[PDB]
């Protein structure tokens, strides 16, 4: 019984690592988007931008 | 007469071991069923199961 429980525990831990991996990948995409947005803001901060390109 | 009684006692004891064997086999099946149910519960105790899997 304990060995079967251990196998089930390994499967549960693998599911946990998989869901963590999926979350990590989503966060990677989000971080890339955030960095792009930060660069956009920094570019907008330049004085010579009139209003339209802003 | 004692010899006849001894034969009767041997037959009765053998019937008893037969009953014990049948009960033991059925209870072995029951133990297997309980082990499978325990595995099912441990699997369900995950967090990555939403609702349908449960």
Three-class HEC string of chain A: CHHHHHHHHHHHHHHHHHHHHHHHHHHHHHHHHHHHHHHHHHHHHCCCCCCCCC
Q: Which of B39, B47, B48 sits opposite A4 (nearest CB)?
A: B39
- Closest-CA residue of B relative to A7 is B39
In chain A, which residues have their Cβ closer than 8 Å to the Cβ of B47? Answer: 16, 19
Q: Do A8 and B39 touch (CB under 8 A)?
A: yes
- Structure obtained using: cryo-EM
- Verify whether the Cβ–Cβ distance A5 to B42 is below 8 Å: yes
Q: Are B42 and A9 in contact (CB under 8 A)?
A: yes
Resolution in A: 3.4
In sequence order, the 6+-apart residues with CB closer than 8 A to the CB of B46 are A12, A15, A16
Distances (CA, A) of A20 to A33, B31, B43: 20, 36, 18
Q: Do B46 and A18 lie within an 8 Å CB cutoff?
A: no
Residue B46 φ then ψ, to 5°: -65, 175
């Amino acid at each position: 019984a304990q060995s079967r429980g251990l196998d089930v525990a390994m499967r549960n831990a693998n599911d946990g690592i998989s869901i963590a991996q999926t979350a990590e990948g989503a966060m990677n995409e989000s971080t890339s988007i955030l960095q792009r947005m930060r660069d956009l803001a920094l570019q907008s901060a330049n004085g010579t931008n009139s209003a339209s390109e802003r």
